[PDB]
Design a protein around this ligand. Structure first.
Ligand code: NCN
Ligand code: NCN
Lengths: 284, 284
C-alpha cells in the first residue's frame, strides 16, 4: 500500500521517466504502424522468479498516459507475491499506442522495485529462525528513496532512517567535536530529548564507553563475527535495553552467521544501492 | 565533462536527493556538536577499485550546500580514472557542517555513477581486440538517464537512444500491426524519412527478410553465438552498410565470444539497470 507520501513520490518518478522518453518527440514508429483505435490485451510477465513489487506504480503510469479509465485490468497479482518464471503479474486491455509509450518507464520502475523486494526477501530468509530483522539505509538513489523504502518493506524488511532529521545518529565526526562518544551523546541528549539516539561504534572499546549511556541503538560498524558475539554478550549483561545493529561487512553468505550472534538488526546498504533488476516484459 | 544538459540533470538529481534527506529536519546532531566556524579537509576515498565518474556532481552538491565559494578543492582526480582501493579521488577544505549535510547525497550519486563506469569498463576490456563498441539502452532509472548515460560514456561505452523519438525502432508489436517486419519498416520509412531506422529481429528468417530493405541498424534479439556469426556472414555479403547490434542473452562471460563474431555493437542493459555501487567514503 502506497502512502500518500509514497504515492506522490511514485507520480513524480513516473513523470520524470515519461519526460525523459518523450523529450525528443513522440513514438514516431507506433504512430506510423498502429492506429489510434487499436486495443490489446497485454501482460507483464516475469522472465525470472522473485518477489513482485511496484504493481500499483505500473497502474499509475497508465493513468498518466491513458487516463484513469483508459485501460482495464483483467487480472493482477498482489505486491509481495513470490513468483515463478513465466508468471503473468497483471493482465490489461488498453489502447495499444498508450501501452507502447508507457512500456519502458513502467517496466523500468517495477523491474527495479521487484529487484529490491526480491533481494530483501532473500536476506529475510537467510536469517530466519533468528530474532534479527533486516533493515535498510539512506544509501538510496536520489529521487527514489520513498519507492525503494517501499520495496524493502514489501520484501519483508523494515525501514530505518528516512532522512537526516529522523533520529540523532552520533558518528565519528560528532564524537570528535564533542571530545568523546559520551560527550556527543550527552550534548544531543540535551539538544533533542524527543529524538531517538543511535550511536555508531567501530571498536569494542567505544562500545564499552557508550553502553552505560544507554542509547536507543548502537551500530556495530564493520565488526568481525567474533567481535559481534562479544558485543552482544556485553550488551546483554550491561545494558539489556540497547538494540544492536550490524552494519558493514555483510554479505548474504554471512548474514546468518551474523544473525546467530543475537544482534537485533542487520543494516543492509546493498538492498538499495547495488540492486539487480527483476526481468519483466510486456507481452502483447 | 558534464554538458549543459547533463549539468541540469545533475542539479535536479542533487536537489531531489537533498530534499529527501532534509524533509524531516536538519542534522540536529551536527548542529548540536559542531560549530559553524569549523572547517576541515576531507577526502573522498574509494573503499574499492574501479573507474571514477561523477566527481563534478560532488562539487555541484557542495555548491548547493555551502555556496560556490564555501569550499576549496585542494586536489581531485579526473573522471574516467582507473583507481585502486585507498585512492583519494578528491581532497577538499570546507565547512564541516556543510560537508556532513552533503555527504550521503554526494556519495550516493558518485557511488552510483562510478559503479556504472566500472561495469562498463569491464565490458569494454572484454571485447578489446574486436571492433565492437559497448552501448547502453533505455533501461535506465527514472530521473537519472542523462547521468547514467554520462557514466557509461565515461567507462568507455557509447550512448545509444536517449528516448522514444531518437530514432525509429521497429519491434515485434510494430511488425504485428504492419503485418510483417518488412511492412512496418516500410511504414516508418514513409512516416519519418528523416529519422534513423533500427529494426529488432529475433530470427535469422526475419534477418533475411529485412536485410534487403537495408535499414541503418538491425538488433539481434537473443541470438546464440552461432546465429550471430551467421547474421554477420549474411550482412557482410548482402548489405555491407547495415550495422548489427547484439541484444538480449549477453553476459560478461560471453561478451568476447559474441564480439568475435564481428557484430558492430553490444547493447548492455545491465550497465544501467542492475548496477552495483562503487564503495566510497568521505574521510575527515
Ligand atoms: O542512516 C541510517 O539509518 C543507517 C543505518 C545503518 C547503516 N547505515 C550505513 O549502511 C552501511 C552498511 O551496509 P552496506 O551494505 O552499505 O555496507 C553502514 O556502515 C553505514 O555506512 C546507515
Ligand atoms: O532503445 C535503445 O537504445 C535500446 C538499444 C539496444 C537494446 N535495447 C534493449 O536492451 C536489451 C538487452 O540488454 P539486457 O541486459 O536488458 O537484457 C535488448 O534486447 C532490448 O530489449 C534498447
Amino acid at each position: 500500500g502506497l502512502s500518500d507520501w509514497e504515492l506522490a513520490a511514485a507520480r513524480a518518478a513516473i513523470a520524470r521517466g515519461l519526460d525523459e522518453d518523450l523529450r525528443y518527440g513522440p513514438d514516431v514508429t507506433t504512430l506510423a504502424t498502429v492506429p489510434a483505435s487499436a486495443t490489446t490485451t497485454a501482460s507483464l510477465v516475469t522472465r525470472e522468479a522473485g518477489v513482485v513489487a511496484g504493481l500499483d506504480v505500473a497502474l499509475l503510469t497508465l493513468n498518466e498516459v491513458l487516463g484513469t479509465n483508459g485501460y482495464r485490468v483483467l487480472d493482477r497479482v498482489e505486491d509481495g507475491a513470490r513468483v515463478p518464471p513465466g508468471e503473468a503479474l497483471m493482465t490489461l486491455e488498453a489502447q495499444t499506442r498508450g501501452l507502447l509509450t508507457a512500456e519502458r518507464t513502467m517496466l523500468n520502475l517495477v523491474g527495479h522495485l521487484s529487484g529490491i523486494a526480491t533481494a530483501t526477501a532473500a536476506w529475510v530468509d537467510a536469517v530466519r529462525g533468528t530474532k534479527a530483522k533486516i533493515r535498510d539505509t539512506r544509501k538510496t538513489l536520489p529521487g527514489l528513496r520513498a519507492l525503494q523504502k517501499y520495496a524493502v518493506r514489501t520484501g519483508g524488511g523494515v525501514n530505518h532512517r528516512l532522512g537526516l532529521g529522523d533520529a540523532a545518529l552520533i558518528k565519528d565526526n560528532h564524537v570528535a567535536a564533542a571530545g568523546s562518544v559520551v560527550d556527543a551523546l550527552r550534548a544531543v541528549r540535551n539538544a533533542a530529548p524527543d529524538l531517538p539516539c543511535e550511536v555508531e561504534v567501530d571498536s569494542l572499546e567505544q562500545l564499552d564507553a557508550v553502553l552505560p549511556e544507554k542509547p536507543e541503538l548502537i551500530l556495530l560498524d564493520n565488526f568481525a563475527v567474533w567481535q559481534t558475539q562479544t558485543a552482544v554478550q556485553r550488551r546483554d549483561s550491561r545494558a539489556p535495553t540497547v538494540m544492536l545493529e550490524s552494519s558493514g561487512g555483510l554479505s548474504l553468505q554471512t548474514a546468518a552467521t551474523y544473525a546467530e550472534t543475537g544482534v537485533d538488526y542487520l543494516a543492509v546498504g546493498a538492498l538499495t544501492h547495488s540492486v539487480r533488476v527483476l526481468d519483466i516484459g510486456l507481452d502483447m
